[PDB]
A paper describes a structure:
Interestingly, human [name] ([name]) is unlike several bacterial orthologues specific for Sec and does not accept the sulfur analogue Cys as substrate with any appreciable activity. [name] and CD enzymes are NifS-like proteins that contain a completely conserved active site Cys residue (C388, [name] numbering) that form an enzyme-bound persulfide (Cys-S-SH) or sulfoselenide (Cys-S-Se−) as product of the reactions with Cys or Sec, respectively. Similar to the non-specific [name]/CD enzymes, [name] was found to adopt the canonical fold type I structure of PLP enzymes, forming two active sites in the homodimer interface with each monomer contributing residues to both active sites.
In the P212121 structure, the segment containing C388 (residues 385–396) was ordered in both subunits of the asymmetric unit. Interestingly, it adopted two different ordered conformations in the two monomers. In subunit A, the segment was folded onto the protein in a near α-helical “closed” conformation, restricting access to the active site and placing the active site C388 in proximity to the PLP cofactor. In contrast, the corresponding active site segment of subunit B displayed an extended β-hairpin structure, positioning C388 more than 17 Å from the PLP cofactor and exposing it to solvent. Remarkably, in spite of the completely different backbone architecture, the closed conformation of [name] positioned the C388 sulfur atom in an identical position in relation to the PLP cofactor and substrate-binding site as observed in the group-II proteins. Together, this strongly suggests that the closed conformation observed in the present structure is involved in catalysis and C388-sulfoselenide formation using Sec as a substrate. It should be noted that although the dynamic segment (residues 385–396) was visible in the electron density in both subunits in the P212121 structure it seemed less rigid than the rest of the protein, as indicated by higher B-factors and a somewhat weaker electron density. The [name] structure shows that in the closed state, relevant for sulfoselenide formation, the reactive sulfur atom of C388 is buried in the protein and completely covered by the residues of the dynamic segment.
Residue numbers in the entry:
A (entry chain A): 29 to 119, 133 to 444
B (entry chain B): 29 to 119, 133 to 443
Amino acid sequence: ERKVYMDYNATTPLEPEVIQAMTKAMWEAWGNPSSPYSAGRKAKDIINAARESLAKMIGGKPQDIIFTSGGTESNNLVIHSVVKHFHANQTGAKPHFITSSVEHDSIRLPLEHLVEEQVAAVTFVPVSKVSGQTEVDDILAAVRPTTRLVTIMLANNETGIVMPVPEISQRIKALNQERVAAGLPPILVHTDAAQALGKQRVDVEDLGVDFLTIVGHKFYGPRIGALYIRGLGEFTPLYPMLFGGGQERNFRPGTENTPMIAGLGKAAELVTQNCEAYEAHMRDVRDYLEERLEAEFGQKRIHLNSQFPGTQRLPNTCNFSIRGPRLQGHVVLAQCRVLMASVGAACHSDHGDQPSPVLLSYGVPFDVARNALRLSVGRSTTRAEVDLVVQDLKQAVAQLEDQ
Amino acid sequence: ERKVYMDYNATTPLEPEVIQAMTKAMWEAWGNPSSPYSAGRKAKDIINAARESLAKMIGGKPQDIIFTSGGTESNNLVIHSVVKHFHANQTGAKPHFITSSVEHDSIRLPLEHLVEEQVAAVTFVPVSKVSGQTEVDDILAAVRPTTRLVTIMLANNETGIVMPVPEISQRIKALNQERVAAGLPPILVHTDAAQALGKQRVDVEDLGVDFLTIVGHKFYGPRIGALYIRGLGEFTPLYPMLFGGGQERNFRPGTENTPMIAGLGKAAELVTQNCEAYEAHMRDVRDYLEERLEAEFGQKRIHLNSQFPGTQRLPNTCNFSIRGPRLQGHVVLAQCRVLMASVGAACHSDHGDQPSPVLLSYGVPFDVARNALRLSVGRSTTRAEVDLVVQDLKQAVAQLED
Ligand SMILES: *Cc1c(COP(=O)(O)O)cnc(C)c1O
Ligand SMILES: *Cc1c(COP(=O)(O)O)cnc(C)c1O
């Protein structure tokens, strides 16, 4: 029978209108964006409109947005810039970062690398076993005079848990007043919003952050992204990683990928127009899925890994485990004929055999983490599809148990 | 009426077959290439075929090829790796780079930044005003114990002049034998092949290089790129700029842009299939352009800037000045009704004009250089279109000088 995709957290398909915007730009807007000829001008008009659509999506200003190759580049760029700024201000002190124990690889690994190289100091703040969040008291307790950036993801890709970013920013703003009075540089705050965009409202003024990472392929756009920098070139400096021909105000040089930008901008227009519909629909079907998993297997057999009492999570995500010695997450997914899902981050799928380090940093019991499955629903996902998926998981576990 | 594009050195349109390959991958190959299910492995297979197509284009092996966002990333990545590797083996010497005085902004500016921040030393070798190349003996005379990289553009964007990259690699390999015996680390060689791909044969084995920059939008492909690394992960070290999810063997992590890669793959295919025919057609129509310009303005009025006797150049590029006090490049082009071209690196406000620094580096007399136009033709340019373009340059200059 027909397949049901429930791995939207790993990647989303392109919206038809986004593909249409890309195809048009491929044919019509092929010229160099810098040129005084009509195909270059059309390209420049594409890029300008897309920058405005992205700013509208996050409630910022187009001057605060630069286009990048993706989420990984945007996240590396923030970190890099903070090091270079600190070096500019010195040239044996090192800059210090505060982040969480559960960040995407594109934050965790540049950070670990900086410590391995003795370039930076980093505090990885654990998440509470009670809330599933970094306690903001802990982030603030970790502050030292050499601290320059707090980077805390908006929502976790594996659990859907939403982090208290607005409160972190607010506490950092009150602290920065004491610091400036003491002659210490202000601390900046980044959020990796990769998983939140298109699923719940992301507003840079409600968030209060200085930087924000945008990831197209998480909200039905193409595999590029962007970076928001508050008061870019004015209140917040940004030291490029790349050097070249002057594109993106020299913050990110290289001839602009016009068709990808047309796509990102169109994807952002859709989130602006429809975010409220998307969120509500995802929520209904994810909550339905949870209800139908407990009806079919039993409350006693299901551990809802994404659920902490009173903690916001993404509306589409359900991380759960079914009790049984034979029902490791990868092993169950291999027996499914309908469900397409994951047992973690797409880029850690190789290591599907051992529990997710992320679930383990969330305090998920080792035996429950072995059996963990991440189901993430999308814009098209229906309750009918949820019924087929649960009936697929029902047959799968029976075959692993009859073996 | 109809306009004629002669600015293909700045960018090219996409081939129809390329667009088709991209739009198909958008609909069909959208799953995460890291994911194990059905949709993932379809994307993976698009990426592997594309990397095979890239390999075949340059005469290499798919294991030696990583995908990047474009040529600027690829160029910066090579310079960055050499610095991080030097810092690795030191664990107050600095790494040293030899390059030319005529490189693209994505090579010159990252090196210039490195010398400004005191991270590296750089020798910008000038070009010979007899050959218009950076002679190999001048490159070898720049070598010092801290030298780790020579990077020399395969063909120049401005003039289309081809550099002697094979002889550079051959001599450096020979110098490297004596180095390793003296305990010194070997010198690696990079070429920015941006302007040569799809215009002439490019073969990693004939060029001898350790790195080579590939740029899709210069051969009717998308606005992404790739980097060849000889013996990647075995013989030649690459130290990444980016850190993340393990993609491109951890040399360039980040989820793979599969429709762009599918495009670049298709564009690489068309080059392998048709490089000879593209080259010959280009050379035909460019040569016709130059004979038409001379027939129409006179041999005395036209200064061909690209041209050094017995020096190879791209088949499609014609950089030339028309003699006259009013005829700065941008002034003539602004008067044209058909021709679309460029003035390359030249600038103009209203205080005055600045000729291309690149042409001045080739020794073009300042006054000639101020009048320089870069015309670069493409796969579809016809002799009939050249004729329209010469007619247009004629009416353009006529209105400027009476
Ligand atoms: C997908 C994602 C990113 C960006 O990763 P890419 O592989 O470059 O697209 C960053 N952070 C989170 C939390 C993500 O889910
Ligand atoms: C066009 C070009 C590049 C790469 O430039 P991008 O803007 O990144 O596409 C590199 N080298 C040369 C010689 C070029 O012409």
